[PDB]
Amino acid sequence: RMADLSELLKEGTKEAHDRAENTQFVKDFLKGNIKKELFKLATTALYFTYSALEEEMERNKDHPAFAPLYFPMELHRKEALTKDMEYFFGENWEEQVQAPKAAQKYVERIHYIGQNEPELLVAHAYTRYMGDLSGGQVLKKVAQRALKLPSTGEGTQFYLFENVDNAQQFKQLYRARMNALDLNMKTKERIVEEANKAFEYNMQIFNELDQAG
């Protein structure tokens, strides 16, 4: 069970996960130090990176190495992020925003993988959504308190999974699916490798955000 993909990921991305937890921008957010404009900018980066990831997951919804992990209803953030974008910028928010450079680098990478190495898509989807599920409720409260956002959910719908009754149960089900995938040890290692890349793309988004505010 050392060879379970979920175990290889946990062990393989330990240093990367450690760096993201302890990175200044994450900490500043957790302490309530991130102002409205920087949050709006952070949410913009979220919009473009999730759009891309979810387009490629939709492209590969029938692919043998990804199909079981296709959860548009449960997990997809694009339409929650659109409402958050609407809330902060108004109805023509699309013409008020652009993908920041570090976000557009991740977007490129995800279109590349979804179009060329779709057995590595799970590297992106696992590290992203399972993180989102784990942390949403604490992150939501942090943002609402910092920016005095309504308790009804406007501005923070990204952090709420309105079709997952129990995050812990769903994470267990997702892993069991990820572990049942017919993948050889070489492909798993390439997945762990791409999971590390996925983490670093985020570090660079945070780096660019920290340099902004």
Ligand X SMILES: CC(C)(C)CC(C)(C)c1ccc(OCCOCCOCCOCCOCCOCCOCCOCCOCCOCCO)cc1
Q: Per rule CB under 8 A, is residue 184 in the interface with its own copies?
A: no
Compute the C-alpha angle 190/104/149, nearest 5°.
105
Partner from its own copies, ligand X, none binding residue 9, C-beta < 5-8 Å depending on class? none
9-38 residues in contact with its own copies (CB under 8 A) are: 15-16, 19, 23-24
CB atoms within 10 A of CB 180: 11
Q: Is 112 annotated as a binding residue?
A: no
The residues after which the chain has a C–N gap greater than 2.5 Å are: none
Q: Is 70 annotated as a binding residue?
A: no
Burial 185-211 (b: 16+ CB within 10 A, else e): eebbebbbebbbbbbebbbebbebbee
Piece in contact with ligand X (CB under 6 A), picked from 3-11, 121-129, 168-176, 181-189 = 121-129
Structure tokens, 110: 């995800």
Is the distance from CB of 48 to CB of 103 less than 8 angstroms?
yes
Piece in contact with its own copies (CB under 8 A), picked from 71-79, 83-91, 169-177, 202-210 = 202-210
Binding interface with ligand X (CB under 6 A):
20-21, 26, 29, 42, 45-46, 49, 106, 124, 127-128, 131-132, 134-135, 138-139, 198-199, 201-202, 205
Binding interface with its own copies (CB under 8 A):
15-16, 19, 23-24, 101, 104-105, 108-109, 111-112, 115-116, 193, 196-197, 199-200, 203-204, 207, 210-211
